[PDB]
Design an enzyme around this catalytic site. Structure first.
Site, PDB file in Angstrom:
ATOM      1  CE  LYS A 193      -2.657  -1.160   3.245  1.00 52.95           C
ATOM      2  NZ  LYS A 193      -3.803  -1.008   4.170  1.00 52.95           N
ATOM      3  CD  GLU A 247       3.160   6.033   6.386  1.00 54.63           C
ATOM      4  OE1 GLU A 247       4.166   5.503   5.870  1.00 54.63           O
ATOM      5  OE2 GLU A 247       2.069   5.446   6.502  1.00 54.63           O
ATOM      6  NE  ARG A 248       6.885  -0.108   7.594  1.00 54.92           N
ATOM      7  CZ  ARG A 248       5.789  -0.834   7.764  1.00 54.92           C
ATOM      8  NH1 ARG A 248       4.600  -0.249   7.775  1.00 54.92           N
ATOM      9  NH2 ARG A 248       5.890  -2.145   7.921  1.00 54.92           N
TER      10      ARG A 248
HETATM   11  N1  LIG Z   1       4.813  -2.755  -6.027  1.00 52.07           N
HETATM   12  C1  LIG Z   1       5.717  -3.563  -5.427  1.00 52.07           C
HETATM   13  N2  LIG Z   1       6.723  -4.118  -6.129  1.00 52.07           N
HETATM   14  C2  LIG Z   1       7.620  -4.927  -5.544  1.00 52.07           C
HETATM   15  N3  LIG Z   1       7.596  -5.253  -4.243  1.00 52.07           N
HETATM   16  C3  LIG Z   1       6.638  -4.770  -3.423  1.00 52.07           C
HETATM   17  C4  LIG Z   1       5.621  -3.876  -3.987  1.00 52.07           C
HETATM   18  N4  LIG Z   1       4.796  -3.538  -2.986  1.00 52.07           N
HETATM   19  C5  LIG Z   1       5.250  -4.158  -1.875  1.00 52.07           C
HETATM   20  N5  LIG Z   1       6.345  -4.891  -2.129  1.00 52.07           N
HETATM   21  C6  LIG Z   1       7.073  -5.682  -1.112  1.00 52.07           C
HETATM   22  O1  LIG Z   1       6.462  -5.405   0.147  1.00 52.07           O
HETATM   23  C7  LIG Z   1       7.369  -4.828   1.089  1.00 52.07           C
HETATM   24  C8  LIG Z   1       6.830  -3.500   1.616  1.00 52.07           C
HETATM   25  O2  LIG Z   1       5.570  -3.738   2.231  1.00 52.07           O
HETATM   26  P1  LIG Z   1       4.256  -3.378   1.389  1.00 52.07           P
HETATM   27  O3  LIG Z   1       4.545  -2.206   0.492  1.00 52.07           O
HETATM   28  O4  LIG Z   1       3.783  -4.661   0.776  1.00 52.07           O
HETATM   29  O5  LIG Z   1       3.129  -2.953   2.435  1.00 52.07           O
HETATM   30  P2  LIG Z   1       3.194  -1.483   3.043  1.00 52.07           P
HETATM   31  O6  LIG Z   1       2.749  -0.534   1.965  1.00 52.07           O
HETATM   32  O7  LIG Z   1       4.543  -1.325   3.695  1.00 52.07           O
HETATM   33  O8  LIG Z   1       2.051  -1.580   4.156  1.00 52.07           O
HETATM   34  P3  LIG Z   1       2.215  -0.845   5.569  1.00 52.07           P
HETATM   35  O9  LIG Z   1       2.932   0.435   5.258  1.00 52.07           O
HETATM   36  O10 LIG Z   1       0.796  -0.643   6.027  1.00 52.07           O
HETATM   37  O11 LIG Z   1       3.023  -1.818   6.393  1.00 52.07           O
HETATM   38  C9  LIG Z   1       8.691  -4.643   0.380  1.00 52.07           C
HETATM   39  O12 LIG Z   1       9.673  -5.419   1.057  1.00 52.07           O
HETATM   40  C10 LIG Z   1       8.500  -5.180  -1.022  1.00 52.07           C
HETATM   41  O13 LIG Z   1       9.406  -6.259  -1.258  1.00 52.07           O
END
Ligand SMILES: Nc1ncnc2c1ncn2[C@@H]1O[C@H](COP(=O)(O)OP(=O)(O)OP(=O)(O)O)[C@@H](O)[C@H]1O
Ligand SMILES: Nc1ncnc2c1ncn2[C@@H]1O[C@H](COP(=O)(O)OP(=O)(O)OP(=O)(O)O)[C@@H](O)[C@H]1O
Ligand SMILES: Nc1ncnc2c1ncn2[C@@H]1O[C@H](COP(=O)(O)OP(=O)(O)O)[C@@H](O)[C@H]1O
Lengths: 501, 479, 178, 478, 70
Positions: free
Chosen positions: D162, D188-189
């Protein structure tokens, strides 16, 4: 116009004022926290009185103890001093009502949130006027129309019957609600689209669609901003109910659209929880059953002794993940007149509207729809239920019987009849046409995927060639041999026209 | 005096105070009166369950909470609530407190039995076991009722239970020459109104001349408070009680719904300072059902046959109110969302529904073999249908492939039309005799009529009409 | 019907049955006079200090200030049953509970001018007519925000309230814009 | 200037403050507390009232760390609601929950400020146009069109893509259309907040020198913050956005992520406020606070406040109320199913619930409407066949159902949009597609032009001609 | 909120505290309803000792709190 004329009306309003001897109950407010006002003193306060504050953000007194009174903030009182003289108003949540509401976006405190101007109004209708009596009311014997094909066909609505639209979210529920509103264009049907607890951009979109359709000339939209206090956010359906009582009590049959009711239950839950009224199951207060009972029972059909009007209700209830075993979609199915489901599977699978008759049901029946369609296809609901089972059964399709082959292709073409385009409210005569086209097996030999084209060609052909059918049957409500002959005649002709080509 | 104040009102719970001279007993009717929003002489009746100290008491009200304000007078009747009972109290529809809600002239109120009474001990209970036929096919086959027993309609989410009540009332009210009483216990008011219209139509109420109506209508609203719905079942039960001891006739009860009663009791008990219980309900559920199903007992003095609808929420059985309602029932009929989805009505799960009066020696030792054979092949079909849905009937081996089609015909054949459901179906229903039922089923389970199409059994009263519809279907297969 | 209110009711009722009515009235007046200072109130309100020392101090104050044995016994029961942490609202509501059991209806009639005391007796008789109370403990205080009219406030604490001072303007500014 | 006095109680983050009996402050207004610290007695303890709780005492919520101060501190009522700096002073400045610039730059000029919250905008001040702009991500542009000026909801659990999708969306619309573009970080992180800050610095949308030319007000609120701080940063960011739509009168981009942390802060502060709980854990007022934070996002008559909000669906529960209020409260639901990310598509978006009311013929063209239809029909059919194909294997279907499964998986792996910011994460430099591709790739798939190239031959490539070239390359390498 | 929040027991208490003793012989009801009763007094009551009610409708006592026995 500035400082020129209104001084005479100023003198008229001043001289001739009350100077009353009105002894009032007045309370020193003790405990306001988060939309509630646990108020000290205030002894003789009727539970349900509006209580006037310092501000003007009035409030209903729901609970009351030996020391405090549980009072809510209809209108969030953002600055209320402790110990403020918060007196009640005496009267009990009365609602001004008039026919000049017909179009104005109105707030739950009867206030025009249209921008059209304030409304003169005479009566002051209660917020908890009870249901009409048991003996006083007649059965739902008279039809009311949807404009959508499948609900009219299998699971009919009647004027006074309170069908419950239900389903998961984002599957066209508000869409079919507005469609069955703006179907009513010459049926003398007041619609009360009570919008509860959703996007004001969405309610602006639906009033834009109403202004475009012209249906906002007679309908009354009770909007609810999601930013409104939860007391107002659950109060508004009671205001819509009393406002529809205003027109049903004359003679005028009406329709109401609560939209939704789950947000009503949640807002009422929030108020009951902040009131420290202990919750029942699913962390809700127990009496959301009682709240929706008092709501939906105020919606029925009058008899000739008191005006023979009706208040057919459509409370949409939101259920997550297609569940029925959630608490409020368990209460409202018990206290409604049957329920129709909008499955995400059937919506995204093309059936739009998505009322699978396997779970959807109308529990008052064909007496609430027209005798012509009755005599045509009373049986078609159970026929489609069997077709749905057998088509689930026709997963094992290796050597199907010829009779069940005819049955599955029949109900297949029937299900394809029950598809209709976006916001195309068919004439009820046209619904009789397509339902006889289905039940007389003309389409059985025809093309199975061109049935929509067959139907639009057929309806244009009859609406051009033989519109006398539509008027004679809408004047008789009865499927006679003249209707039969005109139908089969135009069926032969348009079957030829679409065979070639 | 006994005039006290109402200290706290929270919902339909009314904390009434009293001077230390008098603090009345439990279950006693109190009536705040003379006041409303319009200055009316409007009264509200309220009975007591808990009395919370200092000569004060928390009451539940059988009418709406609007009108009455804290610091008002209360007039206890020095007694528990008493319901006007008698043959004059037939005919008219009336309230939980007994007020005739038919809006014409009130019934003669001179014989009032107290609404809370003792339950009859089993030394008074008629231990006479008996068989009842009610003309609906699957019931008189597989769940045969006791003429004297307790009869339950375990219903699903509004499927076939109330229309089944209407059909069964239509079929047996004329049959039973003794008195009858319908209890509207939190029933939908317009469907109870439709029932009242059908009683006016069929002349069982005899609208032109009353008190010869052997049926007696009493109803309590959904929109009424749970204080009203917590005792309207007791009102109907006491009318049947009066007819079961004083009149001591054959009495028929049709209360609907008992789960409304449960929910009202749970509802108010959450408010009146009491803990919750397991999911749904109050901790007093078992004693509520105890009071009811110990007072509706066919006595050696007078018989009674109380039938009742049970709406389970979420359409299950592990729910605690049907977990005790089954324990307090003797003729249980359990409806199914699946058989309603396939249109089969009454959508009974015949696996689930049984009866104590399905003994071989009490139904006939051939009728019992009929019932066991149909339950056997049906249960095996419901066992098989999951494997069907993944591997194909045409794969599923022949010694069960004949049985699946057989039971598939069976359930739709025992779907039979009702004389009132014709508005929902299209064809007027049929009152089927049990000999015709066991005959048609002895055809099907044996496999004599395995040549017939399955939809020839669809929605048919007689097996002869099923053969007739089969010939019609073959005729339309040619045409 | 709080705990402080019902302990007040117990004390007022034992005074009513024992005839120690006005004695306990003046006694709770001097008792809340003593409890006005937070050192002794905090001494009794602290649960850490020893209960026998608290009882000895309590009985010592009783014997020195010459109090009723009924209210003495009452506050001994209070320090025993731990409710002595609530003494402020206990006595502050005990005065009104005593006023209730003696029927004396405290009615704070503020105004902008110190009214004629005959007019105080006049409206006292009028509110005794409308209430049926034994006494109407007429209370007055000069309020500058009140324009000219009488501003009663009666009932249990402040429930029933009539004004003639800003209520005229309030009626006018309300009903004109309607 | 106003009522000084003493805090009477402190309960962790939540504080109960007594006051002079004469005048108590407002509800929802703010007030600082001086208190103490190690070195100096700073006004770092800002505070905000929540519940006036008897005995001339308010029960209030804090905004900073609540250690070191005690009851009996010299509380200062500021009387007004919480002011916050607005205007061009915001532009580029990475400021904090009370508005102070924590970007290690100068204290921004207080000549233009605004209170923290306000009333809902008007029934008439809602706009009328069903505005639509594309992004560049083909699954969105196919079956979930974005109501610009409305609300754009990003759902999903954790580890489903996301914030990465938000980074890609802001990577497009930072230099695409839209005027001032306020990001807000709710929970946010903070390392990823500064990561996207450095991405805006490197991409140059914010401005190193002369920062007042940025059209970006990155007002983050870090996840480390106290619950009152997380409970207010959303209102800060929305105050910036409404200020710009009322004074800049601008189409304002309102990236926020993720408001589940906002309402979770509301829950954990209510649990110390003593308000009774609600469904499974949360505050009873989650509906009303979400109603505030949504109803104060609207497209005005002049400012189409387009909000791209995320919601952390906890443990992938759509039944949960924190979804169950928001996806009523917004327009473009975009749920990101975890199992698609388990399979390996990025972004991992199902079509069945990711939807909008913008998917309408009279908005997107009946052609694009039926395009999205003919996608969604096939994929819903693929799901209702998926749940019975996984048991008992592939070839038990018909020829038609087998072909439909193949074409539905074609659409699915064809929607694998390579992301331009995900090159540093996976390796593939992402691609950009538009409406011509949105119609044409669908057209080739559903017509059967591309009907023999394998499932990898449209995998992780947006453009269908790029998929054809990839098919040429993989057919060449044999 | 406290036990024995009835004031009649407290009237008897503040009348007759003046000793350091108990009430052990019998007692009165202090609270009653739904087939249970929180009663005062007869302080020596064994855990599960039978209770001779008024009107003889006897029952067993399990809750035996300080000022009130259930
Ligand atoms: N569009 C993408 N392409 C490649 N890898 C992705 C993608 N989106 C997420 N990832 C993988 O997911 C990890 C990051 O978490 P992700 O983006 O899935 O959730 P998030 O947006 O961090 O959710 P939240 O911030 O709520 O935890 C990264 O390590 C990456 O490897
Ligand atoms: N007959 C139909 N044909 C095509 N589309 C339809 C039809 N009926 C409804 N829809 C679609 O359903 C979509 C969702 O509408 P709607 O908002 O009413 O669903 P909902 O479940 O009520 O969502 P919410 O409860 O959030 O309002 C609309 O965008 C509309 O295009
Ligand atoms: N197969 C069926 N046969 C008869 N009625 C049916 C069937 N399926 C649905 N119904 C509907 O169900 C309704 C009765 O449901 P029921 O459970 O008896 O009452 P309620 O819905 O009030 O609980 C009828 O009014 C009828 O319209």
């Amino acid at each position: 116009i500035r400082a020129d004329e209104i001084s005479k009306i100023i003198r008229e309003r001043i001289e001739g004022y009350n100077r009353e001897v009105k002894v009032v109950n007045t309370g020193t407010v003790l405990q306001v926290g988060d939309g509630i006002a646990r108020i000290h003193g205030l002894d003789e306060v009727m539970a349900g009185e509006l209580v006037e504050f310092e501000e003007g953000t009035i409030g209903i007194a729901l609970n009351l103890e030996s020391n405090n009174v549980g009072v809510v903030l209809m209108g969030d009182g953002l600055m209320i001093q402790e110990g403020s003289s918060v007196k009640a108003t005496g009267r009990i949540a009365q609602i001004p009502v008039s026919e000049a509401y017909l179009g104005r976006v109105i707030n739950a405190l009867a206030k025009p949130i249209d921008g059209r101007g304030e409304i003169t109004a005479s009566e002051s209708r209660l917020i908890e006027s009870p249901a009409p009596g048991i003996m006083s009311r007649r059965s739902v014997y008279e039809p009311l129309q949807t404009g959508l094909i499948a609900i009219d066909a299998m699971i009919p609505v009647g004027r006074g019957q309170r069908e419950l639209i239900i389903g998961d979210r984002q599957t066209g529920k508000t869409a079919v609600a507005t469609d069955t509103i703006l179907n009513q264009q010459g049926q003398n049907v007041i619609c009360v689209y009570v919008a509860i607890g959703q996007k004001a951009s969405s309610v602006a979109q639906v009033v834009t669609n109403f202004q475009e359709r012209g249906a906002m000339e007679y309908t009354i939209v009770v909007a609810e901003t999601a930013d409104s206090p939860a007391t107002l956010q659950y109060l508004a359906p009671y205001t819509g109910a009393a406002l529809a009582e205003y027109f049903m009590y004359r003679e005028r049959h009406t329709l109401i659209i609560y939209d939704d009711l789950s947000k009503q239950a949640q807002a009422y839950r929030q108020m009951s929880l902040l009131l420290r009224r202990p919750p029942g199951r699913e962390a809700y207060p127990g009496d959301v059953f009682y709240l929706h009972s008092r709501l939906l029972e105020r919606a029925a059909k009058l008899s000739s002794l008191l005006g023979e009007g009706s208040m057919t209700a459509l409370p949409i209830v939101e259920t997550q993940a297609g569940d029925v075993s959630a608490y409020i979609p368990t209460n409202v199915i018990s206290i409604t007149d049957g329920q129709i489901f909008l499955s995400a599977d059937l919506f995204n699978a093309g059936i739009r509207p998505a009322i699978n008759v396997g779970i959807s049901v109308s529990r008052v029946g064909s007496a609430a729809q027209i005798k012509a369609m009755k005599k045509v296809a009373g049986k078609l609901k159970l026929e489609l239920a069997q077709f749905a089972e057998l088509e689930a059964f026709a997963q094992f399709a290796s050597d199907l019987d010829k009779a069940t082959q005819n049955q599955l292709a029949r109900g297949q073409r029937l299900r394809e009849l029950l598809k209709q385009p976006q916001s195309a409210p068919l004439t009820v005569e046209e619904q009789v046409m397509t339902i006889y086209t289905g039940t007389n097996g003309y389409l059985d030999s025809l093309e199975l995927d061109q049935v929509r084209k067959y139907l639009v060609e057929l309806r244009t052909y009859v609406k051009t060639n033989k519109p006398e059918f539509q008027e004679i049957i809408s004047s008789t409500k009865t499927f006679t041999e003249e209707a039969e002959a005109l139908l089969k005649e135009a069926i032969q002709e348009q079957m030829e026209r679409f065979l070639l080509q | 005096k006994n005039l006290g104040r109402i200290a706290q009102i929270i919902g339909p719970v009314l904390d009434v105070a009293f001077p230390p001279g008098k603090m009345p007993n439990i279950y006693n009717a109190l009536i705040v009166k003379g006041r409303d929003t319009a200055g009316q002489p409007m009264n509200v009746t309220c009975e007591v369950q808990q009395l919370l100290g200092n000569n004060r008491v928390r009451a539940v009200a059988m009418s709406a909470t609007d009108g009455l304000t804290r610091g008002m007078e209360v007039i206890d009747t020095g007694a528990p609530l008493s319901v006007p009972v008698g043959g004059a109290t037939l005919g008219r529809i009336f309230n939980v407190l007994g007020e005739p809600v038919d809006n014409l002239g009130p019934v003669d109120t001179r014989t009032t039995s107290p609404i809370h009474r003792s339950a009859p001990a089993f030394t008074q209970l008629d231990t006479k076991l008996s068989i009842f036929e009610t003309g609906i096919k699957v019931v008189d086959l597989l769940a045969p009722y006791r003429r004297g027993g307790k009869i339950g309609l375990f219903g699903g989410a509004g499927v076939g239970k109330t229309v089944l009540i209407m059909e069964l009332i239509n079929n047996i009210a004329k049959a039973h020459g003794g008195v009858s009483v319908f209890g509207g216990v939190g029933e939908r008011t317009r469907e109870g109104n439709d029932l009242y219209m059908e009683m006016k139509e069929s002349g069982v109420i005899n609208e032109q001349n009353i008190a010869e109506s052997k049926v007696a209508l009493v109803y309590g609203q959904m929109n009424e408070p749970p204080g009203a719905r917590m005792r309207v079942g007791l009102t109907a039960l006491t009318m049947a009680e009066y007819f079961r001891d004083v009149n001591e006739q054959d009495v028929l009860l049709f209360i609907d719904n008992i789960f409304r009663f449960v929910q009202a009791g749970s509802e108010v008990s959450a408010l009146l300072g009491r803990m919750p219980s397991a999911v749904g309900y109050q901790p007093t559920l078992s004693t509520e059902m105890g009071s009811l199903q110990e007072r509706i007992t066919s006595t050696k003095e007078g018989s009674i046959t109380s039938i009742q609808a049970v709406y389970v929420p979420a359409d299950d059985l592990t729910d605690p109110a049907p977990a005790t309602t089954f324990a307090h029932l003797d003729a249980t009929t359990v409806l199914s969302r699946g058989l309603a989805a396939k249109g089969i009505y009454p959508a009974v799960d015949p696996l689930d529904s049984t009866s104590t009066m399905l003994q071989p020696r009490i139904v006939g030792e051939e009728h019992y073999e009929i019932a066991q054979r149909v339950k056997e092949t049906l249960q095996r079909y419901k066992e098989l249908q999951d494997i069907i849905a993944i591997l194909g009937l045409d794969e599923l081996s022949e010694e069960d492939r004949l049985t699946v089609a057989r039971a598939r015909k069976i359930e739709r054949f025992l779907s039979q039309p009702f004389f009132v459901a014709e508005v929902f179906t299209g064809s007027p229903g049929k009152y089927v005799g049990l000999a015709e039922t066991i005959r048609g089923f002895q055809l099907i389970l044996s496999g004599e009529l395995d040549s017939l199409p399955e939809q020839a059994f669809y929605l048919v009263g007689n097996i002869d009409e099923a053969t007739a519809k089969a010939m019609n279907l073959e005729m339309e297969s040619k045409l | 019907d709080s705990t402080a209110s019902r302990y007040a009711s117990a004390l007022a009722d034992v005074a009513d049955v024992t005839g120690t009515l006005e004695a306990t009235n003046s006694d709770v007046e001097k008792l809340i006079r003593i409890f006005s200072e937070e050192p002794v109130y905090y001494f009794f309100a602290n649960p850490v200090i020893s209960i026998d020392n608290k009882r000895s101090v309590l009985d010592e104050i009783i014997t020195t200030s010459g109090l009723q044995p009924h209210t003495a016994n009452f506050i001994n029961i209070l320090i025993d049953s731990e409710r002595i942490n609530l003494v402020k609202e206990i006595l502050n509501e005990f005065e009104d509970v005593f006023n209730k059991i003696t029927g004396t209806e405290v009615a704070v009639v503020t105004s902008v001018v110190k009214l004629e005391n005959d007019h105080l007796a006049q409206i006292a008789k009028g509110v005794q007519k409308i209430t049926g109370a034994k006494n109407v403990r007429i209370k007055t205080v000069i309020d500058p925000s009140l324009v000219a009219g009488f501003t009663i406030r009666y009932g249990n604490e402040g429930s029933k309230l009539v004004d003639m001072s800003v209520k005229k303007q309030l009626e006018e500014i309300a009903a004109q814009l309607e």
